[PDB]
Amino acid sequence: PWPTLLSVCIHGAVVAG
Amino acid sequence: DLSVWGMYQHADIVVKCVMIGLILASVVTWAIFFSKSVEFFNQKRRLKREQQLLAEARSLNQANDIAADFGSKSLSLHLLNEAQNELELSEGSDDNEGIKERTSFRLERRVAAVGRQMGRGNGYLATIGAISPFVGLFGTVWGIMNSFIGIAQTQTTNLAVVAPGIAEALLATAIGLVAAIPAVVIYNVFARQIGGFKAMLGDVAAQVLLLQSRDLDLEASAAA
Amino acid sequence: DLSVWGMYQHADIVVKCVMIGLILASVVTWAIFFSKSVEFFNQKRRLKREQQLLAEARSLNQANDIAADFGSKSLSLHLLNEAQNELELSEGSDDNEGIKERTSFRLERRVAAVGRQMGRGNGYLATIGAISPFVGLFGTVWGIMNSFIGIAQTQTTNLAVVAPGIAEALLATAIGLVAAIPAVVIYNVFARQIGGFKAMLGDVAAQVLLLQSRDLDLEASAAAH
Amino acid sequence: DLSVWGMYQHADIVVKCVMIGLILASVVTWAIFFSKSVEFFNQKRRLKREQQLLAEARSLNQANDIAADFGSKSLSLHLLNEAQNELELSEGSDDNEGIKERTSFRLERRVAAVGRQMGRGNGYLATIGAISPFVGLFGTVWGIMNSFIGIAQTQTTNLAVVAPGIAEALLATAIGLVAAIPAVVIYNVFARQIGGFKAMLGDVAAQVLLLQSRDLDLEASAAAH
Amino acid sequence: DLSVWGMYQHADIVVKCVMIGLILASVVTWAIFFSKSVEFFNQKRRLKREQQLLAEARSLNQANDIAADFGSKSLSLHLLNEAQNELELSEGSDDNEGIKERTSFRLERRVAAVGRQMGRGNGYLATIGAISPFVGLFGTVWGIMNSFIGIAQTQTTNLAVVAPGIAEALLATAIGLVAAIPAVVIYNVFARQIGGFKAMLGDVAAQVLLLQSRDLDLEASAAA
Amino acid sequence: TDLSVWGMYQHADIVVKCVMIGLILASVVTWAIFFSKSVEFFNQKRRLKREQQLLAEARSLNQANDIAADFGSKSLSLHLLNEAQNELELSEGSDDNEGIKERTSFRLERRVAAVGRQMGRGNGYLATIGAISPFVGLFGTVWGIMNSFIGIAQTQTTNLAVVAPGIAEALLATAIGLVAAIPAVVIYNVFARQIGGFKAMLGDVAAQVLLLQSRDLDLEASAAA
Amino acid sequence: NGEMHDINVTPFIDVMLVLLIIFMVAAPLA
Amino acid sequence: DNGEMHDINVTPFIDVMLVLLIIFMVAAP
């Protein structure tokens, strides 16, 4: 499901820390 | 050492689980948003066009002949079938106002049922908006309490020993608000957008009723 | 010294009483959840299965015949036999519109009554979700006052001698939020389940009214012919 | 000493007036609770006893013969005699649709008027439950402010010179919460108890409309036959 | 000195401005309360007398004869005239249900218009109650900012020189709440006083509909 | 070394920079909505008030059309009159009048709702920005404050000299949040008042059209009888 | 649905007041 | 209802209280 894949992608990037 | 990432890695397990739970709640509120924003955009875009096609209609049978071009998923085609089915089930009736009352009742319930079907995911947005501040504050209070137990155990006066623990505790409030604010905003956007969509669908259901109401009164008049 | 029970026991009588009060609120807000969720389910499943059968019916007479095998606790049978009762008590009348208005009113009153009876527990959940962090904060503030009275009596200056008192105090608020969070999510789950259920019951009630209304009008036509 | 009553004695006039104001708001919250709870247990216990007696009725005349034993202040008798009065004022008219309409409107008006009158106290409880935490907060701001006056006048950092402001801010918070908690609890229990009672009285008024509507049909059918 | 007047006198021009703005907000919320409370008392006292007299009426003509000496401002006389004016606009009509419906629609419009018209100054009370806390907080935040800018540009660090500057900042929260609480209390009181009055006026309008509807269908039935 | 209310933004942390620009965007959009709405809304209400006072003379729907015929295609009063007239010219073959009255009532109800729903266009921003801007300011301040505690922990040192710029940033985020929130609440409340006034004025013109239509139909039916 | 969907802020204001008072007691003693 | 917003909102006072918390933490020991 793109929604959840796109959501975890935009978070994944901001949670790179 | 003490980056924001290091601040998570050094914190207590309870507040680390609070931070992970708020990050997962953030992933959910954004997944619901990207899911529903596209869905409401497509349904709004389609329904607004079906209404423009139906604006030309003069009688219910002509509205059916227009709407037969609409896909089987279309809400306006569904309403028109909810009207046409009340005619075909009533075929022996000489009373017309009973057909008008039963049709109005069916379509009003169908518009409400579609409007409710839009809302499926909003319980998560409402919950995540309401509890994320409280889950953040529990993380903050727990971290502060744990630091003062540290001071009671290590028996040391210097507040610079507490400063890391205060930063770890405030980070749980910060992540709490980052989970809360999008969910509270997006819930209010979808509540207003559903209200706008129900009203647009009601304006189509009203045209179906107005078409049927003229059609029956003209036919009953022309019989005498 | 300890970090949880070491402070809970040393704590004073009113902080003890407040923490016990929030633990009692936590257990009731979870009993309601287990007690309601099994019933609401058995209700949601049973009513959904009845609606799927009744949706085939073409007249109120046929709807009675297929509903009669439902249990005495059936919500839909308890609507169908009431629409039948309103027609039976009215049997001397020739005013079909009068039968329709009475049945519509009586069915609406019963759908509301089942709605009130499903929502029985929510007063506790809505109250506990609102008050419990403030009840915790009162326990914390009074705990701070007792620690403050404690220093003002002995006039100490050691940060560590205050540390255990201020900790216990915060625990009260921590227990306050731990009682609050379940009550808000549990309240929202039942608020959404009630909304879906009252609407689903309303669609069964509407089908009973539609079947009766159509059946009376066709019968009046067949009589007058 | 340095006791909690010494802490009240030492506090500024503005914080004394906040504490006294909230204590008066607290005691009148309990006074109106003990008053209305008794009056909501009396009226509900009585009305439950009416509905159960009145549920036997099969004609509006039989409903009057059952209700005649009810006391002068009985709400159900006070609904039956509205329906009776609308018929007795209207004997010259054969528009039964008009008698039903006018009666339904009077009964709907009266059920609303009883609910409206029963709610009298709730405006106070709803005010205290919203406002009293912010009245508390103002007292805490005044305490924190007086702390900074204490250090500004003495250029010295110690606990003993800020102590009056911490004392005031704690007392203003504690009494603010002690006013807020029972007010928001009691407002919820009365909003639940009124919502149930107003609906239950609606279910009694509905029975009066059903009996009157049925009587007029059976009379009109017997006159036509 | 450091009295409340000394703090106001010594404060920065923005914080001094916020104190004056909040005192004007306090004055206007009390001026609204005393202006509206005497009008709600006079409207209730008068309307209760009209409803107590009209309860004796048994026809719309008798209700007009009872109402004939009510002052020309009277809301019950206004409602009787709205109903009477429909009959004498409608003189040729045999559709009595038409007269009933048109009258019911007019009196509902009139009752809603009175309740809306008399709740006029509740927008000032709502606005003052909502923004008062903030403006006051803005006064504090500005006063605190100016204090530290001061300390950051002048080093020489000690809480003793900041303390009066942050006390006279905190005072603008205290005044901010003193403006808020009366306004939010009064708005809530007037929302319930309007709700009770609009309902009482509704019960007088209901008596006019009942009197008209009854004597109209009696006169129609007696003509048979 | 020294700082100013611009230099502290130039010295702020990324998050706090991003939050401050975010609330400055919220500020410029709320003022853009105020000018976009108020210039139109004043002119629409000023028009409609003239139409309502001019149509209030009318005695029949034909007399109202002869008054309205030059109000301009954009006048809501002419749009309601013409769209009520449109039900008669579509119902020409109907000897039933109460169906025309019912359909016209239903059409005008939806036009009044739709025009009100269209005038509310900006309120989604104004309510969101007014309620949520202080929470975004609070997030911004908590991040700056948390960074200042990291500055303490990093340096193992404690003086106002190093912290004062850090709290000046953290306060500036709050000040910008308040400068965004106050106008948005004021603008939202004045437009809620003005919308409610306009909705009632438009509903009164719609009611006048229904009254004029129904009375004229009932009088024409009586004259034909 | 009466779903609770909004941040009631007063618990926070009051827990932050607790946090302030706690350090406003302990810090001048340290 | 009228749909205007009249509630007492005091949210930014938390921001003041964090700064006061910093003043005590930094100045007072």
Residue numbers in the entry:
A (entry chain F): 10 to 26
B (entry chain E), E (entry chain C): 9 to 232
C (entry chain A), D (entry chain B): 9 to 233
F (entry chain D): 8 to 232
G (entry chain Y): 12 to 41
H (entry chain Z): 11 to 39
Copy text from the publication:
The Ton and Tol systems are sophisticated molecular machineries essential for virulence and survival of Gram-negative bacteria. Both systems rely on the proton gradient at the inner membrane to produce force and movement that are transmitted to target proteins associated with the outer membrane. We have solved the high-resolution structures of the E. coli TonB-ExbB-ExbD and TolA-TolQ-TolR complexes, revealing the inner membrane embedded engine parts of the Ton and Tol systems, and showing how TonB and TolA interact with the ExbBD and TolQR subcomplexes.
To eventually detect structural heterogeneities and/or TonB binding at different ExbB, we performed an additional 3D classification step with the 227,384 particles that yielded the 2.8 Å resolution map. In these new orientations, TonB was found to bind ExbBE (18% of the particles) or ExbBA (13% of the particles). Except for the binding of TonB to different ExbB, the three structures do not show any noticeable structural difference for the ExbBD subcomplex, nor in the way TonB interacts with ExbB. As deduced from the TonB-ExbBD structures, one TonB subunit associates with ExbBD via ExbB chains C, E or A. The upper panel has the D-box bound to the ExbD periplasmic dimer in one orientation, leading to the binding of the TonB TM domain either to ExbBE (orange) or ExbBA (blue).
